[PDB]
């Protein structure tokens, strides 16, 4: 057998009971989801902005970032719907740290029970403060522990074509963005949107920690996310092709543009260049761009865990992010671009 | 919420108790896994042949097919290690029938409990007759109900890059083949092989139907499956590039070639053309080709569930397959090629 050991896992209900949603938290989620729904439906000209760390590895830095971002969210609420990237799960090209939930202590001790408690506690605090959260839905079992506190979700480039993730999206209570393939393929995301919009029947683990048969209604609040491929795909030229592709597929011609990952060629400072281009498109009247994604942290760059020496505070241990000063500038640029488009 | 209904699911132990593996079925699995391991280690010059229906939709036709295939398995055993495709799970491009387990009655009744009982009983019958089984591991929960009766597994083109599928493979007791991406991307499969070979810690459902924390050892019996992209990738030029790519990644230059799907341009009869070329490669001395995959049924072609017309017996309701006559001829061609390669 290739199973070394099997260990006890607290059921979702244990986490929901220990960390119940507060009225403020529930309101934050309900309002954010509705706001995003209105944008996708075309009943609001504001831009959805999913911004924050590539991954959460420290609740302290996470809450500090959340407090700073909440101020920006309030300041620019007329042009932007700001949602924090609160990513607890990370897909790896091969192997590596999978996130706070899988290995919170970042030492391969895999204390997942601790990870889930730490994650829900933080997610609860952030929502309670009035700031919506976004994250990648990678795992099929973790959703039950945190989905009630998520206002928007993403299906990664490496899983957009996966039927199991499309099934999951079809039953999520929040809007969902599907990233194009790592090679830049757009079709897998368009297909994912259509698939997730239909009802599905599949096996899933309930809040009681038991497997069961579930039937979903389908999720109409799904959209594509352009995150680049071999080459970036954020330009007006690419946006134009994607819009036609969506229409041809019978879908609304709308897109979210990720400024990071392949669109910045893995160079964090380049997110500022992507921003400039996207702002020009938006300011120029491009109504298709309904959202953007940015990897930002308190301090720019990133650091390695394999290094050894203590970790620098508020610095990413996964993908490099832009610092807070550039983050303030970028959010401002976007807000102004939205105003320009609005006229 | 987008969750319409939640229904009770029999736990794996219920199916294991109702349908225990017989001594002969257990032997079939044990011997097949060992034989494939020997081929993957370069200690056997025979060819692994995973052949059978695109999908199983009728136990009666499946068993008739199994008897016919078993006869050839015994007759050609000195050259081929024949394993029947007994696929109960199907990944769709968008939406569609997902296979016998998900909807055994093929009418959207999704009687999965019936599906699991029918599936395991069929696997038990086929294995007890001495014929090993192959299947795609798409779902994260169904493995516990059938894995003990699987001699080889596949991770589909649409899920090879998925971390959750790589995790699953890392803990499977049988050899696993990773298909290249739908766009022909080879790198995702090479990365998958390395990822699956390492130990993983993740959440999964136990045989008791409860979620838990699992630790895997890693699966060293993984290989790539060439199934085409925008263009077929079965020719010597492509095999050469893949052998080089595997070696560059520190892996043995071995490949399984799927004659169907993108390699036949989804035209079932071209599987015979792919066979002719692959046989020439094998007979010519290509040792890297350790296996092939072929979509075959009692009757050639396919049919749709959409018309409402009664289904023809022994004919695929998913991808088109070659019929029995062509199957017998193809298997003999492969056996002759392996004999020639040996000289
Ligand atoms: Mn990232
Ligand atoms: Mn097929």
Swiss-Prot record, chains A, B:
It comes from the Bacteria. SUPFAM superfamilies: Aldolase (SSF51569). The keyword Cell inner membrane does not apply. GO terms for molecular function: 3-deoxy-7-phosphoheptulonate synthase activity; identical protein binding. One of its GO terms (biological process) is amino acid biosynthetic process. There are 3 DAHP synthases, AroG is feedback-inhibited by Phe. The other 2 DAHP synthases are Tyr- and Trp-sensitive, respectively. Homotetramer. This is Phospho-2-dehydro-3-deoxyheptonate aldolase, Phe-sensitive. It comes from Escherichia coli (strain K12).
């Amino acid at each position: 057998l290739r199973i070394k050991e099997i260990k006890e896992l607290l059921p979702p209900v244990a986490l929901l009971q220990k960390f119940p949603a507060t009225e403020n938290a529930a309101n934050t989620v309900a309002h954010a989801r509705k706001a995003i729904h209105k944008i996708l439906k075309g009943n609001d000209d504001r831009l959805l902005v999913v911004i924050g760390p590539c991954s959460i590895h420290d609740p302290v830095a996470a809450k500090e970032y959340a407090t700073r971002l909440l101020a920006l969210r309030e300041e620019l609420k007329d042009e932007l719907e700001i949602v924090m990237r609160v990513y607890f799960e990370k897909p790896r090209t091969t192997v590596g740290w999978k996130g706070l939930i899988n290995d919170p202590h970042m030492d391969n001790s895999f204390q997942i029970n601790d990870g889930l408690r730490i994650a829900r506690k933080l997610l609860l605090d952030i929502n309670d403060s009035g700031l919506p959260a976004a994250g990648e839905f990678l795992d099929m079992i973790t959703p039950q522990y945190l989905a009630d506190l998520m206002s928007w979700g993403a299906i990664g480039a490496r899983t957009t074509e996966s039927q199991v993730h499309r099934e999951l999206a079809s039953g999520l209570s929040c809007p969902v963005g599907f990233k194009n393939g790592t090679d830049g393929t757009i079709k897998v995301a368009i297909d994912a949107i259509n698939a997730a919009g239909a009802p599905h029947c599949f096996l899933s683990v309930t809040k009681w920690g038991h497997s069961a048969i579930v039937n979903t209604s389908g999720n109409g609040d799904c959209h594509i996310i352009l995150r680049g491929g071999k080459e970036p795909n954020y330009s007006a030229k690419h946006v134009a092709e994607v819009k036609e592709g969506l229409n041809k597929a019978g879908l609304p011609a709308q897109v979210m543009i990720d400024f990071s990952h392949a669109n910045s060629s893995k160079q964090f400072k380049k997110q500022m260049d992507v921003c400039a281009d996207v702002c020009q498109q938006i300011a120029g009247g491009e109504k298709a761009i309904i959202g953007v994604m940015v990897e930002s942290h308190l301090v720019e760059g990133n650091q390695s865990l394999e290094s050894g020496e203590p970790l620098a505070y508020g610095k990413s241990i996964t993908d490099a992010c832009i610092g807070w000063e550039d983050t303030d500038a970028l959010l401002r640029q976007l807000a102004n671009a939205v105003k320009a488009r609005r006229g």
